[PDB]
Amino acid sequence: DYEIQRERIELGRCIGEGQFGDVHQGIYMSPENPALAVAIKTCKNCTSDSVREKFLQEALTMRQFDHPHIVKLIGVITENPVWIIMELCTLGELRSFLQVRKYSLDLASLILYAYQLSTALAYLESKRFVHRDIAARNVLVSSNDCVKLGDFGLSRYMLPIKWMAPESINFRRFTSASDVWMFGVCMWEILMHGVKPFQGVKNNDVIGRIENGERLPMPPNCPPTLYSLMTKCWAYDPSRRPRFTELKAQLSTILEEEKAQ
Numbered sequence: 107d108y109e110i111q112r113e114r115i116e117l118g119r120c121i122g123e124g125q126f127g128d129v130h131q132g133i134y135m136s137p138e139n140p141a142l143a144v145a146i147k148t149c150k151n152c153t154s155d156s157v158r159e160k161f162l163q164e165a166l167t168m169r170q171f172d173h174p175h176i177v178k179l180i181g182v183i184t185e186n187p188v189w190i191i192m193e194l195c196t197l198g199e200l201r202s203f204l205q206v207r208k209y210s211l212d213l214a215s216l217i218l219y220a221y222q223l224s225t226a227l228a229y230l231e232s233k234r235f236v237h238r239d240i241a242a243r244n245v246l247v248s249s250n251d252c253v254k255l256g257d258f259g260l261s262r263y264m265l266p267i268k269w270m271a272p273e274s275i276n277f278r279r280f281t282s283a284s285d286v287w288m289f290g291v292c293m294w295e296i297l298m299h300g301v302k303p304f305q306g307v308k309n310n311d312v313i314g315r316i317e318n319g320e321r322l323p324m325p326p327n328c329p330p331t332l333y334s335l336m337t338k339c340w341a342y343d344p345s346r347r348p349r350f351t352e353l354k355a356q357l358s359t360i361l362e363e364e365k366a367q
């Protein structure tokens with residue numbers, strides 16, 4: 107079921123570097139279907155059963171999810187060298203896409219991306235799963251009107267201090283409420299066209315500013331209703347933060363109001 111024959115894969119260019127090895131673009135010659143564009147996770151030192159075990163569990167992690175805005179697992183090649191075949195998001199990394207299209211992208215598109223991610227994160231919340239690393243860094247672009255959460259294994263930390271909730275920095279507490287804080291910072295990066303939060307600020311100075319009430323500023327052209335939604339995600343008390351179901355519904359309202367100008 108999940109096992110792929112290596113001769114059905116054509117390896118292409120390197121599209122990134124992971125913890126276990128390089129990630130490549132490629133083609134999967136599907137048994138009785140048209141060839142698919144794929145992403146190949148390779149493993150450099152998977153010859154030992156300890157590294158091989160940790161690598162293949164990353165594929166099992168993606169196998170338990172089925173959502174239109176989360177990258178899907180295509181299969182694995184468990185003979186050496188071990189590979190994990192994932193779906194390809196043709197247009198690449200979100201920060202890069204937003205920076206190149208800083209002027210060719212309308213506000214309705216930015217809100218759509220934020221909305222699509224809240225549907226993936228509400229699906230994850232429904233399965234009681236805490237992501238622990240929500241940032242534009244781990245968002246990929248399938249098409250002009252479609253973004254997805256990238257591979258969970260390839261997501262660096264599953265420390266990104268400038269994205270973390272105060273309880274995650276102070277006590278290493280990771281809940282769905284701490285993911286809402288992280289999503290708020292992701293929405294700010296989207297609206298800022300791929301600009302990193304807190305530039306020119308040292309990681310240790312970050313918690314001092316946050317505890318004193320300092321928050322990321324309202325991005326230019328960001329609807330005031332959307333910035334008020336981000337500030338609710340940034341409530342110090344995690345019980346005061348909204349849930350992903352409320353975030354999804356409110357993002358849908360802000361989106362339709364922008365579509366009707």
Ligand SMILES: CN(c1ncccc1/C=N/c1nc(Nc2ccccc2)ncc1C(F)(F)F)S(C)(=O)=O
Nearest residue numbers: 121122123129145177192194195198256257260261
């Ligand atoms: C940023 N991430 C990476 N981190 C380390 C290594 C690789 C990635 C990127 N992976 C993927 N890239 C694409 N498309 C793509 C990306 C860049 C250029 C051209 C095309 N499609 C799917 C994936 C998948 F499914 F494997 F994730 S992340 C956390 O999103 O996986």
